Amino acid sequence: MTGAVCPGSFDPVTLGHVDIFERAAAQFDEVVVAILVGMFDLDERIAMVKESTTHLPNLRVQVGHGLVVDFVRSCGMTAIVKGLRTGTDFEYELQMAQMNKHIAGVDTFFVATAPRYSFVSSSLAKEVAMLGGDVSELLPEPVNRRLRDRLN
Amino acid sequence: MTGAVCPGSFDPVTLGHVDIFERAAAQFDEVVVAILVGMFDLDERIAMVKESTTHLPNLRVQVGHGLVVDFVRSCGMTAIVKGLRTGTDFEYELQMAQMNKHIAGVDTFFVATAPRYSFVSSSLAKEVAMLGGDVSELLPEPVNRRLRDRLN
Amino acid sequence: MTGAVCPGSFDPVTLGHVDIFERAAAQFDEVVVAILVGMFDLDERIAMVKESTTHLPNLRVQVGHGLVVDFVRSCGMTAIVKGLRTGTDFEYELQMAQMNKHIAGVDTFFVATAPRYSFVSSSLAKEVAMLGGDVSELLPEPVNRRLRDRLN
Amino acid sequence: MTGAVCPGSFDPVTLGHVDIFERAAAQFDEVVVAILVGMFDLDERIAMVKESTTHLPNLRVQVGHGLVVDFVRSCGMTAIVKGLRTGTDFEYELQMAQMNKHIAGVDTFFVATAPRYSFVSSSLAKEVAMLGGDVSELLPEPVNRRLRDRLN
Amino acid sequence: MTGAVCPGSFDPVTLGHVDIFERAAAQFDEVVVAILVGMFDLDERIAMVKESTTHLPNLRVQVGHGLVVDFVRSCGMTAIVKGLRTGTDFEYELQMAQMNKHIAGVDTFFVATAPRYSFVSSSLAKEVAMLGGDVSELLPEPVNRRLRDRLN
Amino acid sequence: MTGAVCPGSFDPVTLGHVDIFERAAAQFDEVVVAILVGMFDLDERIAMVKESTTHLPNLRVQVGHGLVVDFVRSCGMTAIVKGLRTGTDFEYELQMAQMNKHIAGVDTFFVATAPRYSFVSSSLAKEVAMLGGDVSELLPEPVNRRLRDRLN
Ligand SMILES: O=C(O)CCc1c[nH]c2ccccc12
Ligand SMILES: O=C(O)CCc1c[nH]c2ccccc12
Ligand SMILES: O=C(O)CCc1c[nH]c2ccccc12
Ligand SMILES: O=C(O)CCc1c[nH]c2ccccc12
Ligand SMILES: O=C(O)CCc1c[nH]c2ccccc12
Ligand SMILES: O=C(O)CCc1c[nH]c2ccccc12
Numbered sequence: 001m002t003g004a005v006c007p008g009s010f011d012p013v014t015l016g017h018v019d020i021f022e023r024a025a026a027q028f029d030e031v032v033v034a035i036l037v038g039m040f041d042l043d044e045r046i047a048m049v050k051e052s053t054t055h056l057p058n059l060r061v062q063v064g065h066g067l068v069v070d071f072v073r074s075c076g077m078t079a080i081v082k083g084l085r086t087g088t089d090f091e092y093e094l095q096m097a098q099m100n101k102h103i104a105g106v107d108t109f110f111v112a113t114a115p116r117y118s119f120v121s122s123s124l125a126k127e128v129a130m131l132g133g134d135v136s137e138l139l140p141e142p143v144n145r146r147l148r149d150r151l152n
Numbered sequence: 153m154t155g156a157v158c159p160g161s162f163d164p165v166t167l168g169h170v171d172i173f174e175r176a177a178a179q180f181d182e183v184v185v186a187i188l189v190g191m192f193d194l195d196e197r198i199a200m201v202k203e204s205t206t207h208l209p210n211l212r213v214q215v216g217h218g219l220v221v222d223f224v225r226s227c228g229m230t231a232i233v234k235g236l237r238t239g240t241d242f243e244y245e246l247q248m249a250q251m252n253k254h255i256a257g258v259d260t261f262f263v264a265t266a267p268r269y270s271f272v273s274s275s276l277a278k279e280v281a282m283l284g285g286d287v288s289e290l291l292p293e294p295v296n297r298r299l300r301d302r303l304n
Numbered sequence: 305m306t307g308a309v310c311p312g313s314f315d316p317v318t319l320g321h322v323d324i325f326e327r328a329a330a331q332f333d334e335v336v337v338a339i340l341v342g343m344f345d346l347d348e349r350i351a352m353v354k355e356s357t358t359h360l361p362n363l364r365v366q367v368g369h370g371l372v373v374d375f376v377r378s379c380g381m382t383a384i385v386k387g388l389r390t391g392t393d394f395e396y397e398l399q400m401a402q403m404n405k406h407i408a409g410v411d412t413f414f415v416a417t418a419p420r421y422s423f424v425s426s427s428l429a430k431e432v433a434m435l436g437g438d439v440s441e442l443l444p445e446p447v448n449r450r451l452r453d454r455l456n
Numbered sequence: 457m458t459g460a461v462c463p464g465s466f467d468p469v470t471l472g473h474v475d476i477f478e479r480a481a482a483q484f485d486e487v488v489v490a491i492l493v494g495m496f497d498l499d500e501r502i503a504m505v506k507e508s509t510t511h512l513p514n515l516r517v518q519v520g521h522g523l524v525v526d527f528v529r530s531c532g533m534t535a536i537v538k539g540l541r542t543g544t545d546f547e548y549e550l551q552m553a554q555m556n557k558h559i560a561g562v563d564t565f566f567v568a569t570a571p572r573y574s575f576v577s578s579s580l581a582k583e584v585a586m587l588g589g590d591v592s593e594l595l596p597e598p599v600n601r602r603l604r605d606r607l608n
Numbered sequence: 609m610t611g612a613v614c615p616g617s618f619d620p621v622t623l624g625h626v627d628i629f630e631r632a633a634a635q636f637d638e639v640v641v642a643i644l645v646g647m648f649d650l651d652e653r654i655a656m657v658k659e660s661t662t663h664l665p666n667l668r669v670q671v672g673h674g675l676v677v678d679f680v681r682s683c684g685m686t687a688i689v690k691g692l693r694t695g696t697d698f699e700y701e702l703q704m705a706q707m708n709k710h711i712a713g714v715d716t717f718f719v720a721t722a723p724r725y726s727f728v729s730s731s732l733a734k735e736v737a738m739l740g741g742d743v744s745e746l747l748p749e750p751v752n753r754r755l756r757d758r759l760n
Numbered sequence: 761m762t763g764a765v766c767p768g769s770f771d772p773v774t775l776g777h778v779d780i781f782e783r784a785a786a787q788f789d790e791v792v793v794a795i796l797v798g799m800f801d802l803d804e805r806i807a808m809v810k811e812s813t814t815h816l817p818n819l820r821v822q823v824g825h826g827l828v829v830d831f832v833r834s835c836g837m838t839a840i841v842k843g844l845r846t847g848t849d850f851e852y853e854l855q856m857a858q859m860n861k862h863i864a865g866v867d868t869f870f871v872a873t874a875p876r877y878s879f880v881s882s883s884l885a886k887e888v889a890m891l892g893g894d895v896s897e898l899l900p901e902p903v904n905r906r907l908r909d910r911l912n
Contacts, residue, residue: 002458002483023563027458027535028483066739079483081565084550087247094540095695097568098727103741107479109537109565112553115419119250131218133255154306154331175411179306179332179383231331233413236398239703246388249416259327261385261413264401267875271706283674285711370891391551399847402879407893423554435522437559543855571723575858587826589863610762610787631867635762635788635839687787689869692854702844705872715783717841717869720857 003030003077004109007068011038012143013049014125016117020083023111025056028079034064034071039126044146051142069104080108086119155182155229156261159220163190164295165201166277168269172235175263177208180231186216186223191278196298203294221256232260238271307334307381308413311372315342316447317353318429320421324387327415329360332383338368338375343430348450355446373408384412390423459486459533460565463524467494468599469505470581472573476539479567481512484535490520490527495582500602507598525560536564542575611638611685612717615676619646620751621657622733624725628691631719633664636687642672642679647734652754659750677712688716694727763790763837764869767828771798772903773809774885776877780843783871785816788839794824794831799886804906811902829864840868846879 004024010017010033024031033053035045042063049061064071072080080100082093090110097108112118120138128135129147136144156176162169162185176183185205187197194215201213216223224232232252234245242262249260264270272290280287281299288296308328314321314337328335337357339349346367353365368375376384384404386397394414401412416422424442432439433451440448460480466473466489480487489509491501498519505517520527528536536556538549546566553564568574576594584591585603592600612632618625618641632639641661643653650671657669672679680688688708690701698718705716720726728746736743737755744752764784770777770793784791793813795805802823809821824831832840840860842853850870857868872878880898888895889907896904 002485004483027460027563027565029458067736067741070740085247086250087243090546091695094568095693095727095729095732098571098694099732099736101568101570102727102746103736103743107483107567109483109567111563111565112550112557114557115422115554118419118422119247119254121247124247124251128219128251128255132222133219135255138254154333156331179308179411179413181306237703238706239699242394246416250419253416253418259331259415261331261415263411263413264398264405266405267402267878270875270878271703271710273703276703276707280675280707280711284678285675287711290710371888371893374892389551390554391547395847399845399879399881399884402846403884403888406879406898407888407895423551423558425551428551428555432523432555432559436526437523439559442558541855542858543851571726574723574726575855575862577855580855580859584827584859584863588830589827591863594862610789612787635764635867635869637762698850702872706875709872709874715787715871717787717871719867719869720854720861722861723858 001030002028003032003075004028004079004081005032005034005068005072005075005077006081007034007036007064009038009122010035010045010049011040011122012045012139012147013052014117014120014122014139016083016085016113016120018052018140019113019117020081020111021053021056021059024081025059029058031056031059032075033059033061034068035061036064040146048140048142048146052140069100069106072106073104078106080106082108082110084110084112085121087121153182154180155184155227156180156231156233157184157186157220157224157227157229158233159186159188159216161190161274162187162197162201163192163274164197164291164299165204166269166272166274166291168235168237168265168272170204170292171265171269172233172263173205173208173211176233177211181210183208183211184227185211185213186220187213188216192298200292200294200298204292221252221258224258225256230258232258234260234262236262236264237273239273305334306332307336307379308332308383308385309336309338309372309376309379309381310385311338311340311368313342313426314339314349314353315344315426316349316443316451317356318421318424318426318443320387320389320417320424322356322444323417323421324385324415325357325360325363328385329363333362335360335363336379337363337365338372339365340368344450352444352446352450356444373404373410376410377408382410384410386412386414388414388416389425391425457486458484459488459531460484460535460537461488461490461524461528461531461533462537463490463492463520465494465578466491466501466505467496467578468501468595468603469508470573470576470578470595472539472541472569472576474508474596475569475573476537476567477509477512477515480537481515485514487512487515488531489515489517490524491517492520496602504596504598504602508596525556525562528562529560534562536562538564538566540566540568541577543577609638610636611640611683612636612687612689613640613642613676613680613683613685614689615642615644615672617646617730618643618653618657619648619730620653620747620755621660622725622728622730622747624691624693624721624728626660626748627721627725628689628719629661629664629667632689633667637666639664639667640683641667641669642676643669644672648754656748656750656754660748677708677714680714681712686714688714690716690718692718692720693729695729761790762788763792763835764788764839764841765792765794765828765832765835765837766841767794767796767824769798769882770795770805770809771800771882772805772899772907773812774877774880774882774899776843776845776873776880778812778900779873779877780841780871781813781816781819784841785819789818791816791819792835793819793821794828795821796824800906808900808902808906812900829860829866832866833864838866840866842868842870844870844872845881847881
């Protein structure tokens with residue numbers, strides 16, 4: 001039984017994130033989205049991920065605390081899957097990947113997000129949305145709905 | 153009628169900035185320096201840019217608020233011009249450039265600052281100036297004057 | 305009168321190139337595509353660029369020889385416009401940009417290609433096309449037609 | 457049934473490669489090492505990979521021709537797994553990864569090699585070995601044996 | 609008489625730092641570790657560096673204030689030696705190196721830390737140690753001892 | 761007795777190279793410029809380095825063959841000093857630096873060339889000089905003289 005953990009704050013989840021979830025879900029038996037304790041509270045973040053991943057029956061959403069590698073090992077896996085996008089601090093991701101292999105033997109697999117979703121990030125989406133800009137093509141509809149409510 | 157916006161906080165403007173202003177002014181009909189709301193207050197920042205750009209008759213200085221692309225489109229342009237220097241977070245600039253094209257159709261043109269001004273930044277100039285170091289060859293004289301006054 | 309030169313081998317021109325041509329054409333009075341002396345011969349390359357740029361009335365195609373900056377200065381301009389894509393050797397582009405400013409005072413403006421065209425290059429398109437892969441969504445139809453003929 | 461292809465020339469295979477093979481083999485049901493048509497001939501390359509991977513029962517070695525994505529799809533998989541090391545041209549790997557997703561829907565997962573094997577590459581190992589240097593701690597013993605024979 | 613300054617906050621010193629100290633100590637007549645004013649207080653930081661460098665008789669530990677280049681010049685040297693690791697912001701280090709040469713004529717020499725210590729940093733070690741992870745193989749024993757005490 | 765080797769092809773030596781030689785010569789007891797076996801023949805390359813370094817009495821020029829680390833160790837040193845400029849393939853330099861430490865225990869120190877000489881390289885200088893461009897401000901006069909002769 002193989003399994004990947006996709007860790008993050010997901011505040012909010014973007015279509016870049018969902019693209020990675022989909023690719024992980026297609027290559028591993030189970031995928032766990034670990035929401036790592038912002039604009040939205042924990043329960044909203046969970047809801048937004050769930051609502052955006054109903055098409056992925058082997059995907060599961062869970063709150064995580066502490067080291068990602070602890071979460072991974074407790075849940076019975078040894079793989080982390082993370083996306084790459086424009087603006088990713090890859091050097092820091094690499095540093096963490098090597099540290100995570102060192103302390104817990106967990107591998108990290110990096111996958112590039114699709115070009116169309118390669119420039120969205122949670123932070124930039126929020127900042128642009130707060131200043132009036134339309135990022136709805138870059139976020140799941142469950143997120144757009146909640147984003148709209150707050151702006152109103 | 154073509155036009156470029158050069159956006160930034162300009163706290164203070166450096167000769168790296170002025171180098172870019174000069175290159176934009178030579179290639180576009182109008183250049184607008186948008187001061188985006190630090191050490192110097194808004195009026196000082198404006199004054200320092202104006203005083204340092206008297207040799208650029210098609211350049212105009214204006215305070216901006218909100219999204220740069222909104223500023224650009226309201227002022228009747230669709231081009232942003234930004235400089236590159238050592239320490240520029242280019243991946244983040246790229247992310248913003250793609251986001252800005254997405255939401256408003258605005259293009260961003262990047263130009264490398266001259267080598268002699270390639271290692272000055274507003275932040276580093278301030279920090280070095282506060283700790284006693286001489287950065288006067290890297291800043292316009294209007295900035296040096298104001299910088300000197302505060303240190304005294 | 306402002307003018308940009310877009311230099312390259314264009315063997316063949318891609319939709320990444322055309323994206324840059326379009327953005328240059330919208331910001332400068334004249335754009336000259338300089339085809340710098342492969343799979344297609346010079347006349348085919350010229351034809352493919354012309355056929356792919358009929359919607360750009362201020363764009364002009366010309367063969368170039370020697371230094372780009374010489375071409376730029378002889379044609380009455382001082383700006384080069386180049387695109388950035390995934391796999392661009394940007395450090396080398398920067399080196400050339402600084403060298404070109406040094407020897408001839410010519411500025412180079414870099415613009416990111418649209419995400420959807422950010423992973424095509426002339427070389428990779430050819431290599432993929434030769435090994436059977438379908439890159440037709442990444443190239444102008446004038447190029448696809450000629451590409452098809454040779455493969456047959 | 458999940459499966460990863462690890463493509464390359466493997467001329468010769470290094471312990472950096474074997475590190476990646478091991479991590480792929482632990483996360484996928486099947487791993488296929490595709491030797492993509494140098495110093496060693498095809499049969500030696502195959503032999504060296506086989507001899508260095510006897511501890512990986514779900515790993516299989518095969519010669520490949522043409523597009524990696526064709527190989528992947530014909531063999532019934534949709535994942536490529538590639539390692540990262542110091543000197544990897546990651547921008548080009550990213551370009552190929554996006555092109556490969558475009559033409560065939562195949563995902564590419566990148567994993568960092570262990571630090572101790574992060575500076576070996578086939579090319580550098582050969583060049584150093586030819587000029588007298590000892591790289592035996594960076595290569596499998598099956599490779600060292602064959603490397604020694606040729607130098608003698 | 610030649611001399612290198614190795615500046616930093618060293619909160620705490622890591623084996624990556626000690627690796628660089630050792631390489632500097634072997635190439636310069638004197639090495640000064642400048643602790644630049646966190647988790648540990650100044651006196652603990654000093655103690656931890658001293659205790660970890662007893663094998664380096666030409667190495668000296670000193671608190672520093674203000675510009676590194678001022679410290680360097682006052683102490684009778686003109687060289688800074690800094691390490692590189694995974695996650696180093698090298699572009700910012702380069703910017704500072706050029707600024708430091710500009711204002712004070714001081715050269716900065718960069719050396720890569722050993723691969724085995726290439727993913728430790730003071731910040732990441734602390735964060736991992738606080739969340740329960742074992743980083744003891746990446747830190748001097750004098751640091752491990754003090755780290756253990758606080759966690760208990 | 762401390763010593764640095766500055767290895768390269770130096771075809772021809774540039775003022776970027778001489779800048780690095782000067783900084784090495786000021787920090788080490790002896791500097792050996794190792795010319796590693798182009799446009800100029802070995803004897804011209806030697807002559808050009810010598811003629812450009814008469815102001816550096818502790819600098820010595822020598823032809824080298826094989827591994828740089830062999831040269832370094834035979835000459836009684838354990839340090840390599842290399843410059844960084846715009847267009848340097850730093851990832852490959854890092855790979856070689858780690859390989860060189862591995863096989864022979866030799867450290868490599870990297871130093872940034874001055875901004876004014878940061879965009880010259882032997883290759884680009886030659887190519888620009890062949891196509892008519894004036895790079896004389898970027899090369900020693902001994903090189904300019906020889907460069908002029910060949911062009912005539
Ligand atoms: O950076 C992003 O916002 C998108 C990619 C990304 C970062 N961490 C991730 C974790 C899981 C899936 C995707 C990601
Ligand atoms: O980074 C800098 O400080 C100099 C380059 C720079 C950033 N934003 C800019 C906007 C306009 C002109 C120049 C710049
Ligand atoms: O690299 C590419 O193939 C696309 C971007 C590109 C490089 N040189 C260019 C010149 C003009 C317009 C675009 C480009
Ligand atoms: O670059 C290397 O030599 C090691 C990493 C590497 C490149 N392609 C690979 C394919 C499969 C497994 C590992 C790799
Ligand atoms: O980044 C690190 O933590 C290790 C490398 C490093 C940064 N500054 C340094 C100063 C002296 C010696 C080593 C270093
Ligand atoms: O790259 C360059 O041409 C200049 C920097 C450089 C590379 N190798 C070098 C060796 C010694 C001194 C300087 C250098």
